[PDB]
Amino acid sequence: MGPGFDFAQAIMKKNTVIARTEKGEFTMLGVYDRVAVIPTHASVGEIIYINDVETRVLDACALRDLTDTNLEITIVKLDRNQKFRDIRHFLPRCEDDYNDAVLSVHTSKFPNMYIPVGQVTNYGFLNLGGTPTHRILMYNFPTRAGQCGGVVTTTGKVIGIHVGGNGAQGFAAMLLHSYFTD
Secondary structure, eight states: OOHHHHHHHHHHHHHEEEEEETTEEEEEEEEEBTEEEEEGGGOOOSEEEETTEEEEEEEEEEEEOTTOOEEEEEEEEEOOSSOBOOOGGGSOSSOOOEEEEEEEEOSSSSTTEEEEEEEEEEEEEEEETTEEEEEEEEEOSOOOTTOTTOEEEETTEEEEEEEEEOSSOEEEEEOOGGGGOO
């Protein structure tokens, strides 16, 4: 409808796949080469389905901060025959608050879904499903089941991936440029 949705659509069309684990179907953001991200609660194993194709996982790392606190981001390297467009220059360098964000989802259940979530707060600490979690972003939308892994963008930045909600608020794990230096 406007330039927020335009940036979100550009990311979804080239940089997302549908990931399936034993814990469900997730929106999965491809960042560069064969490297993608997914919520840690997807419990990625040795094999994952990518757009319904059996795919070997070459590496999977559940990120934690230097206090050994969960960040809820898993970085996955996929044994895929094709690279993602490199979008690392759209990742923030620092923790921040944002205006006018869009949450975008692409699954069998929710195809081509875009939600204008508005203002995004650097919330910080969240007890997420009983697990102490850091670097949480918060937005005021009744976010449901089937949204996990959804991409949070502003015009020009890819800032997080949806990891939960409490019925009134939704929560995303930050993406930072420093996670994807090689």
